[PDB]
């Protein structure tokens, strides 16, 4: 199976943090780690009200640098207690760990820049924040199955996304051409049309009444059935993929 | 099979209840429990329009206390003609009925009480009443195995609600950040999109223009796009848990 | 296989009217019987608009006429060519031609009733025209499997209908409970809810903003979510049906 | 496989073009062609913005030529060495390079025509040149896939379409029939209620409220279900036929 650090002091940390199946202190620290993580995207969540919209006050930073404190903390006893260390930059929860860091250092970091003395940047950095909800991957077979059928499939997204590349380009142009001559027409150019040409194919709808005319509607009749066809195709080899992988586990 | 009551006067009844292929008399009981039934909820959801919106008057109770005489009546008749009690407790069907009979019999409750002498509590009450429509599952073959699917797949439904609640958190919050630049935007906070992500993954359709911007298009392409997928993976599963349990019958 | 009426007088035209494969006036009368229905079909749409919204004038009549006069001439040559009787009132086409006749005569017999001297009634007259179209099924393969596949699988619409409404009836319910505090709601009483539960169970889409409070939207997301469920059931067994049914004459 | 020229400058060239497998300049000769696809797209699409709604000035005008000469001169190329010439007629790639010179070669005949001395020829070719896209096909196997999946299902796509007429008729009149008393009605004719279901049947929405009376819900609803069913009917036979032809290539 998976190697063992062979020391005194290592093999029961090792398993106390990367098994949680062996000692209760284990279970307990997986249902702490659990609970940390839903508390972050709580707060996440919770930040951007338009009610609310560097310590002791705001008292949601005092709990950020609590979230920060315990992910730093178990990172670094999962690096130190590690037999191989190529493994260790190799896998993939790793990244993610170091990614949700990241965010809250560099805001210290200008944040201290500014106290001595673009929006841009910190606006992306705030999107960067979301991944946080990935570290649940760690805990549920589920997303982990997700990313085995994700990798496994990734020809048929390809061609999924090429096929309805291909039929919004024909529709948006056939539907502006067949309504340019009235002036009461929404659609002023063939870009103006993409919207709406990846919202009937998908079948999502509109809303609004935008092609008026005859040829219009006859296009829109077409753009409807065809979406159908070009999106079932490469549908069943993914449901298959996952099929596969999820009846492994527990049947094998 | 099912054990009798070996008695001279209880497994005539028990027959005559239980089981309606026996007798004449049994079938028409069947019929006569199944009217009152549909009668109960016609009464239920007629008497909410506003024309209409304790006894004599407001022939609607003349009504109510009807039905719940006859349920009433039953339940205690297939209670006594029983060989086992713990079965009984153990079964479902016996549940459901003790539910039924629950509102009315605490309204009456309340009203003596206030006639010798929250809104909340009555409201909750009321929506309680719903349930007269799952005691059909008594007689339809349908219901029960429809029962069975769901009991069988829980681990499914679970993965489905989980894989959507990630991805709606995923895209409400994309969609927020690349969005609020502009004051024309009817996203003010990340909980205020989660209904747009739940109706667009699902392709239902907003209905509504919220989606304004560039990158707000972009993210929404992707959001339909991607419902498809974590909808249609755990699907196959239980469609094929409900065909085995339907065949299973009839074939088996 | 089939009988002939072996005579010398009826094999020739039973041959020439109810096989077009044998003779080239065969196929002739074959493909004149589908202009005439597509004719009718145009006729009974178009007569309806607003510009034009008893002979001689109004050229209109002057082509039904035609259309029922060859309609029942050919009705009349099925009927007198066949060897058996009680298989001809057996048979559905048969039927099928006798509804179409009698759209237009009952109109002229009332228009000669009040020659010499209800609305509801003419209204459902006019309605039951619309069989014409059915009549294409002696001319394609496809309507005749579809009846077929129709015909083996009553009990699978049964469910789907029966869920459908049990569905219906406890969503608009829930919806209708949870959102009655507010004075800005649409939702006045459980039938007036019906409506919007049938129409995001089917991922068709309301449209308008009609749930607005927040039990209202986690209503709605239960709603759209178990209306997947609940349609894909008993959907598989009709497809499988159908290409059976399909397959079997071209491969069998 | 496939005959070669058997020359000394011709296999050297018929390699070069035709097969870009062979030598590196072969790898870049494709890379070059894709991009020019591409670039042709991009100009096709923003030709039509409303801020820029016959040469130097008008640089648009300028780029077009140079996708014309390159396009025209690869097809030159190919012609020339090519073994068979019937064949070189008979294939589809070649219909298609001939259709993209066409719009603009007829374009400089217009003006220079009118340089020495109606609209809706010029908005069909305007709306001809669409079909570069299609150029495509030379690069990808998902489009050639997608080619064959296409020409071996006909019959399928026909009965799609059939079946899909014959319920825009029926629910049409029926919607149109059960709703007219009323003066408040958007349909006043059938013809006017073709989109709506048309929208319905295949879940993409119509968005307005247009059915209003009691019997326009039940028509309503009834064609929302008969919609899944005669759109199910006939996708998994082009399902079945795509995954075949998808994976006899790669496993094969
Ligand atoms: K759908
Ligand atoms: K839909
Ligand atoms: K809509
Ligand atoms: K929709």
């Known amino acids: 199976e998976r190697p063992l650090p062979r020391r005194d002091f290592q093999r029961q940390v090792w398993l106390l943090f990367e098994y949680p199946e062996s000692s209760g202190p284990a279970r307990g ?13 709580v707060i996440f969540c919770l930040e951007t009200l338009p009610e609310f919209r ?20 178990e990172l670094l006893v999962r690096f130190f207690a590690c037999p191989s260390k190529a ?21 210290l970091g200008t944040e201290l820049a500014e106290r001595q003395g ?3 940047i910190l606006r992306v950095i705030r999107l960067v924040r979301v991944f946080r909800i990935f570290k649940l991957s760690r805990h549920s077979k589920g ?51 993409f919207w709406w040409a990846v919202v009937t194919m998908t079948t ?30 490469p549908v069943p080899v993914i449901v298959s993929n996952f099929n596969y992988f999820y009846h492994r586990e527990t049947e094998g």
Chains 1, 2, 3, 4 share one sequence.
Not at 29 to 41: D, E, F
């Open 204 to 233: 999502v709808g509109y809303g609004d009444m935008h092609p008026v005319t005859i040829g219009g509607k006859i296009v829109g009749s077409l753009c409807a059935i065809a979406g159908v066809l070009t999106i079932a195709l």
């Open 29 to 41: 620290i997986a249902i702490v780690s659990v609970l940390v993580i839903l508390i972050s995207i």
């Open 87 to 107: 493994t260790f930059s190799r896998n993939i929860m790793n990244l993610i760990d170091i990614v949700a860091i990241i965010p809250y250092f560099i805001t």
């Open 143 to 193: 997303l982990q199955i997700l990313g085995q059928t994700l990798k496994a499939s990734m020809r048929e997204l390809g061609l999924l996304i090429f096929f309805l590349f291909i039929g919004v380009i024909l529709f948006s142009s056939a539907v502006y051409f067949a309504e340019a001559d009235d002036p009461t027409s929404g659609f002023s150019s063939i870009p103006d049309a």
């Open 54 to 73: 560097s310590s002791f006050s705001d008292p949601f930073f005092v709990v950020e640098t609590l979230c920060i404190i315990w992910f730093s903390f």
């Open 118 to 120: 673009s929006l841009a």
